[PDB]
């Protein structure tokens, strides 16, 4: 799809990779 590309993108942009560490790191 590409209707959320805008949306559903930033909707968690970074905002991933930062919940993505401190589970994976700090756990």
């Known amino acids: 799809h590409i ?3 805008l949306h559903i993108l930033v ?3 970074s ?3 930062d ?3 401190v589970v ?3 756990k």
């Open 3 to 5: 209707n959320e590309l």
């Open 11 to 13: 909707f968690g942009e």
């Open 24 to 26: 994976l790191y700090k």
């Open 15 to 17: 905002l991933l990779n």
């Open 19 to 21: 919940a993505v560490t």
